[PDB]
Design a binder for this molecule. Structure first.
Ligand SMILES: CCC[C@@H](C)[C@H]1CC[C@H]2[C@@H]3[C@H](O)C[C@@H]4C[C@H](O)CC[C@]4(C)[C@H]3C[C@H](O)[C@]12C
Ligand SMILES: [Zn+2]
Lengths: 146, 334, 102, 135, 69, 146
């Protein structure tokens, strides 16, 4: 165990992944894209951990978190939740920065069909480069961290 | 700067900084003409057993190499094997052999040859590589000693076995080679043993030549060391009674007060053993600074008596040059 | 007749072009390694010269010389040995003339 | 150009605490209200006194085997008209407030914090840089 | 048991200074700190060699087995 | 010994720097330790028996002289050349940490080099002591490398 009563240290792993995948020519990710990449990686891992009741059949979604349906895999599930939360925190931080510089904070996906790089009315030489300097999370960085 | 600054709690600037790559100027390349112009030797004292001389504008590595080669690489002759006939003393045979091996012998090391170790003992020692010293002392009661005396020098005959009792026994051509320079100990008054009536010592010591690295008895120098030239800078004039106090922070001959201006000035920085006492007192802070010249070495080579200190230093320089030449002539095996 | 066992070139540490090398020298210690280090660092082409005694029980000395592309490490070592010889000759001459001066 | 940043600073405090060769100086920019500097300086090579004006610039190159080779003597360089050149890496860009960011440089363990409006600190790009200081 | 021939630290021969040191203490009535300096023992490593020496050979020789006591 | 660098009691390193190795490393990594190229090279040959190939980094001080800080010496100790794969990133507190003047400032801007930061393999701040090189702490250099 590499953490304080945790299997993995999230801060050092995130810093390691950011440093060893660093590239100034790599475009950063919007917060919803970071969340989507985290969900894409962590989906099948926590979906194969199906919850069965004591009888041996599937458990309804309304009562997944009840006490009598606690299985041996829950710790794993807990880990994944914490992992997602940590990544979400990073995305939230980026979103907050985008809300402090006058830009639009895309913590949630904008639309199902909306396309194109939607920052286009903000001046590129002033506010885009500043938020790129302060926070730049690439797909390679988050994939390496996961 | 080439001045090792001495502070109250630390020593600063102790490393040599004369090489290209220290700065963008890329100067201080190795030029043998510049080193020949800059290097200086000043002998201040030259006795038969001690030499004092300053090496100026030389690097620390070379002077330290000379010191190390003088201590542990210049060969000298000392007793190596001891054969005992009837040692009846209180002193054990091992102790007596060790003491006899520790005496310095006044033998020129260039008159001998290195002993081949892999040869057997029947033909290992010849007349070219072994000096034989015989000792034979028997102690008897003095028949006409004073009644009221208690000195063993008067109550007994040979109660004190000294190093001058080590007689030299020439073997073969050593009867002619060592005719004008007989083998005597360099310190004849070394007290080897003490006896009482009824005790006897008789032994033969085979003496070969070796280096100081193998054993400390083969080191030709009792001591051989250098020290950097001290340097005292008085940044502000020190007047009156404080100057007298400023005089008491140094050995007596180091600094003095001028009679006219009544201010202290450095008289002889060589006598200054660096005790940095003046750095204890707050009144002399920001008024005096101490240092040592990094490329100004004061060698003091004291011989053990076998041969002159200047010969020892010259042999050390020749040994370093021969090491470099031998490494240059060797082929590099992959 | 030449001493093949005196100085060796450790193949596993040298470079392909001979710019960087490490030499193992038998029956030496700091008294020669330090002098060689000081002399070789005065070569304008040498950017790395350092000696080491790996164990006191072994009478051995490993010296590493890394240069730029102008000269190989073997040439730097030979130049350093020759230059140390010249330094010893100059010191010898000055000392032997100041003895006869007084 | 090669010069990422250039300004003139007024020193307000020199803190040599627990060290004998390295002092931490605090400086405020002249003709720039929001620019502030906190820098570790080898005081023996470059002596700094309080209330002294000194020019600080940050460049990406001094030009006008893989070991580091010093430039040849006599080659013209940006370091020729400066008194103290350091080499280091930018490792942290953080925000102090709106319209105000801080950049952290580490020149082999000697730190520099440069705080100011992000209009002026736009050219710093989180890479290796040279810090040139003169009087 | 007997005065060592050489100083342990440097290597100066101090085995020939024992009798002279005893004579300067006994006959000339010199103090112990000046008799050492008069014999050329300047370094403290040589001074401790015969200043702290215990001459046990005289005590050991009282029990001579080769001669009635 | 290599497979048992960590005690099973807590997972912390148990085989690490002892006395007289922590002190020397602290004196090398002290803030007022500056070495020229000769002393740098001798130190680098002193840690590797004159065998390992070292890529000398550009110096931290350039205009007056060429001086390398001891933190660069330990950066070369962790990663000697480009062929070494060791790239470790960590942030840690020393045994004696004196917090900075302002609470807004980060931990590395403290007095007496309390906070150590390693990015890539360069030691950007802090000194090396029992917290970073010794035993008992999970943020040490050797623990990260292992
Ligand atoms: C085989 C080696 C011989 C070697 C040890 C002999 C042969 C040549 C000798 C030197 C020269 O005589 C010149 C000087 C004369 C002075 O009086 C004493 C010193 C002096 C430097 C000599 C020392 C020594 O005596 C040497 C080097
Ligand atoms: Zn002594």
């Amino acid at each position: 165990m590499e953490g304080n009563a945790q299997p993995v240290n999230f801060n050092r792993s995130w810093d390691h992944a950011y440093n060893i995948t660093f590239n100034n020519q790599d475009k950063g990710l919007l917060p919803y894209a970071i969340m989507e990449t985290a969900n894409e990686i962590l989906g099948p891992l926590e979906e194969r951990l199906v919850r069965y009741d004591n009888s041996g059949c599937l458990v309804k979604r309304e009562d997944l978190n009840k006490a009598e349906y606690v299985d041996q895999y829950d710790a794993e599930r807990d880990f994944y939740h914490s992992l997602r939360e940590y990544i979400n925190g990073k995305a939230t931080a980026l979103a907050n920065l985008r809300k402090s510089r006058g830009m639009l904070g895309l913590l949630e996906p904008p639309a199902k069909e909306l396309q194109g790089i939607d920052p286009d009315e903000t001046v590129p030489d002033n506010v885009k480069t500043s938020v790129s300097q302060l926070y730049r999370i690439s797909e390679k960085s988050v994939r390496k961290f996961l | 700067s080439n001045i090792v600054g001495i502070e109250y709690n630390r020593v600063t600037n102790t490393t040599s900084t004369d090489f290209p790559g220290f700065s963008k100027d890329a100067e201080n390349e190795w030029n043998v003409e510049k080193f020949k112009k800059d290097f200086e030797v000043n002998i201040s004292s030259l006795d038969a057993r001690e030499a004092n001389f300053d090496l100026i504008n030389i690097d620390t590595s070379i002077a330290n190499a000379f010191r190390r080669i003088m201590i542990s690489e210049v060969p000298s002759v000392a007793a190596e094997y001891v054969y005992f006939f009837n040692n009846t003393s209180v002193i054990q045979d091992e102790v007596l052999a060790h003491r006899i091996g520790l005496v310095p012998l006044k033998v020129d090391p260039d008159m001998l040859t290195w002993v081949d170790s892999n040869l057997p003992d029947d033909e290992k020692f010849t007349d070219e590589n072994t000096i034989v010293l015989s000792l034979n002392v028997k102690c008897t009661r003095n028949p006409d000693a004073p009644k009221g005396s208690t000195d063993p020098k008067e109550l007994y005959n040979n109660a004190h076995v000294y190093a001058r009792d080590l007689k030299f026994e020439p073997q073969g051509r050593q009867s002619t080679t060592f005719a004008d320079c007989p083998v005597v100990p360099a310190d004849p008054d070394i007290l080897l043993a003490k006896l009482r009536p009824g005790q006897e010592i008789s032994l033969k010591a085979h003496c070969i030549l070796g280096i100081g690295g193998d054993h400390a008895k083969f080191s030709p120098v009792s001591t051989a060391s250098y020290r950097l030239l001290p340097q005292i800078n008085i940044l502000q004039p020190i007047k009156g009674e404080s100057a007298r106090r400023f005089q008491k922070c140094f050995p007596p001959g180091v600094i003095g007060i001028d009679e006219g201006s009544d201010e202290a000035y450095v008289k002889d920085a060589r006598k200054d053993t660096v005790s940095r006492e003046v750095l204890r007192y707050e009144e002399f802070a920001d008024k005096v600074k101490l240092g040592r010249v990094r490329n100004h070495f004061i060698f003091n080579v004291e011989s053990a008596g076998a041969m002159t200190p200047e010969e020892i230093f010259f042999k050390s320089v020749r040994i370093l040059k021969n090491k470099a030449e031998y490494l240059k002539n060797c082929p590099i095996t992959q | 007749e030449p001493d093949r066992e005196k100085i060796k070139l450790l193949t596993q540490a040298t470079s392909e072009d001979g710019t960087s090398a490490s030499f193992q020298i038998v029956e030496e210690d700091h008294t020669l390694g330090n002098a060689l280090r000081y002399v070789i660092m005065k070569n304008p082409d040498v950017e790395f010269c350092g000696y080491s005694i790996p164990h006191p029980s072994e009478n051995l000395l490993n010296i590493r010389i890394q240069t730029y592309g102008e000269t190989t490490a073997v040439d730097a070592l030979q130049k350093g040995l020759k230059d140390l010889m010249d330094l010893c000759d100059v010191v010898e001459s000055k000392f032997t003339e100041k003895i006869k001066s007084m | 150009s090669n010069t990422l940043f250039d300004d003139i600073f007024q020193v307000s405090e020199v803190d040599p605490g627990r060290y004998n060769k390295v002092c931490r100086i605090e400086a405020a920019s002249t003709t720039q209200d929001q620019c502030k500097l906190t820098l570790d300086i080898n005081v023996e090579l470059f002596p700094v006194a309080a209330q002294d004006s000194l020019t600080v610039t940050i460049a990406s190159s001094l030009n006008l085997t893989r070991s580091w080779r010093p430039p040849q003597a006599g080659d013209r360089s940006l370091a020729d008209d400066y008194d103290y050149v350091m080499y280091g890496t930018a490792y942290k860009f953080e925000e102090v407030s709106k319209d105000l960011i801080a950049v952290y440089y580490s020149f082999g363990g000697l730190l520099m914090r440069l705080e100011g409006n992000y209009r002026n600190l736009n050219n710093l790009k989180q890479e290796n840089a040279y810090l040139l200081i003169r009087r | 048991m007997i005065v060592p021939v050489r100083c342990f630290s440097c290597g100066k021969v101090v085995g020939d200074k024992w009798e002279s040191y005893l004579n300067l203490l006994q006959e000339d009535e010199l103090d112990e700190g000046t008799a050492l300096s008069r014999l050329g023992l300047k370094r403290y490593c040589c001074r401790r060699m015969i200043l702290t020496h215990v001459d046990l050979i005289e005590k050991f020789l009282r029990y001579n087995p080769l001669e009635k006591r | 010994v290599k497979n048992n660098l960590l005690t099973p009691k807590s997972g912390e390193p148990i085989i690490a720097a002892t006395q007289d190795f922590i002190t020397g490393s602290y004196l090398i990594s002290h803030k007022d330790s500056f070495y020229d190229r000769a002393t740098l090279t001798q130190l680098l040959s002193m840690m590797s028996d004159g065998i390992e190939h070292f890529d000398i980094p550009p110096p931290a001080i350039m205009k007056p002289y060429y001086l390398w800080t001891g933190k660069q010496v330990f950066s070369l100790l962790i990663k000697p050349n480009h062929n070494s794969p060791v790239v470790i990133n960590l942030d840690a507190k020393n045994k004696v940490f004196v917090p900075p003047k302002s609470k807004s400032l980060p931990n590395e801007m403290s007095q007496n080099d309390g906070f150590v930061i390693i990015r890539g393999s360069q030691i950007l701040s802090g000194v090396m002591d029992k917290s970073v090189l010794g035993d008992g702490k999970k943020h040490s250099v050797f623990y990260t490398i292992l």
